[PDB]
Amino acid sequence: AIDDGVSADDVTVTGSAGDYTITVPGTLTADFSGLTDGEGASISVVSVG
Amino acid sequence: VKLTFDPVLTTYALDLDGASAGNFTLSLDGKTSANIAYNASTATVKSAIVAIDDGVSADDVTVTGSAGDYTITVPGTLTADFSGLTDGEGASISVVSVG
């Protein structure tokens, strides 16, 4: 429910503690300006498992 | 299928034909709603529909009417299922002209 209506539920998430290995259709991006400190704020792509 | 140059909003009438109790349902391009009450408010019907289909903003949907008699304008193919409505086997949903 990132759409105003329903959105894809075959989306799956792995990893932990903020690092999360999200798997999704299309293209994804993020906003971290709501989070004050820790500064690891990123997004990155991986293929080998 | 009707063919048009630009994409267009389709106007519907939804009529519960004096149904007295129970719930109906709506589906937009085959995406289903939750259960809707036989006297749900006109603003409740809009507020339900906007939650159903990917990208369908509350900007593009609009609804007007009264309890048991609603007119709806929406970009997709709207449909309904009345199974679980009572005194309501006469209920109907249909596409409507300009008027």
TrEMBL record, chain A:
Which domain of life does this protein belong to? Viruses
Q: Where in the cell is it found?
A: Virion
Full protein name: Major capsid protein
Its ancestry begins with: Viruses, Duplodnaviria, Heunggongvirae, Uroviricota, Caudoviricetes
Which gene name belongs to this protein?
A: 14
Which stretch of the full sequence is covered here? Answer: 349 to 397 of 397
TrEMBL record, chain B:
Domain of life of the native organism: Viruses
Of the GO CC terms on this record, one is:
virion component
Where located?
Virion
Keyword annotations of the record: Virion
Q: Where is this protein chiefly located?
A: virion
- In its keyword annotation, does this UniProt entry include Disulfide bond? no
Can you say what this protein is called? Major capsid protein
What organism does the record attribute this protein to?
A: Mycobacterium phage Bxb1
Source species taxonomy: Viruses, Duplodnaviria, Heunggongvirae, Uroviricota, Caudoviricetes
Could you tell me the gene encoding this protein? 14
Tell me the part of the parent protein that is shown: 299 to 397 of 397
